[PDB]
Amino acid sequence: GEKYGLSSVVSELRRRTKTYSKHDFTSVRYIRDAMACTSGIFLVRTPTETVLQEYTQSPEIKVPIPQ
């Protein structure tokens, strides 16, 4: 939150999360309603950058097997 300017959201979530102490339907619906507030959109980018972001990475073998 401090990197992106959302500390007023993150601290607001943490201080409200710290008030539930029993496991019933209330604290469960809190989790449901908190998960609902994420934004479900479909990320759009060109295929010519989809390939050259996804298909250019490579694994790194720190301990290879010897010759």
Partner 1 sequence: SHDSYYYIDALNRVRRKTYQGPDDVYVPNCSIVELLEPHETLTSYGRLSEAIENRAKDGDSQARIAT
Partner 2 sequence: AYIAVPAVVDSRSSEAIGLLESFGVDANDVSYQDHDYVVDQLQYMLDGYEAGDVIDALVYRNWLHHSVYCLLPPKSQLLEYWKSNPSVIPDNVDRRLRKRLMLKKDLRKDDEYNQLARAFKISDVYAPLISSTTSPMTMIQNLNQGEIVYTTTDRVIGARVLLYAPRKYYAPHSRFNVGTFPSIATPKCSVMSGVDIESIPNEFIKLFYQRVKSIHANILNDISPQIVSDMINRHVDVYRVDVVNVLFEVVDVADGLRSVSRKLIMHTVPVCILELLGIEIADYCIRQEDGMFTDWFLLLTMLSDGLTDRRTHCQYLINPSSMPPDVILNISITGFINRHTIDVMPDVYDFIKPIGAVLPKGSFKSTIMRVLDSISVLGVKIMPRAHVVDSDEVGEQMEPTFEHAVMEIYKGIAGVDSLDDLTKWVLNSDLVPHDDRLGQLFQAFLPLAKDLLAPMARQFYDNSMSEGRLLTFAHADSELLNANYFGHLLRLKIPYITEVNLMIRKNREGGELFQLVLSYLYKMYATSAQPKWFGSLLRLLICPWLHMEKLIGEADPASTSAEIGWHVPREQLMGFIPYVSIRAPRLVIEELMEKNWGQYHAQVIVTDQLVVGEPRRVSAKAVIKGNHLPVKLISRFACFTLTSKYEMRTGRGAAYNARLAFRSD
Among 8, 19, 39, 48, binds partner 1 (CB under 8 A): 48
Q: Is 66 in the site for partner 2 (CB under 8 A)?
A: yes
The answer to whether the CB of 30 falls within 8 A of the CB of 20 is yes
- Rounded (5°) CA angle 55-59-43: 35
Q: Is 49 in the site for partner 1 (CB under 8 A)?
A: yes
Query: How far is Cα 54 from Cα 26, in angstroms, rounded to an integer?
Result: 42
Closest to partner 2 by CB, 9 or 52: 52
Q: Which does 37 bind (CB under 5 to 8 A by kind): partner 2, partner 1, none?
A: none
Q: Which residues of this protein are in contact with partner 1, per CB under 8 A?
A: 43-45, 48-49, 52-53
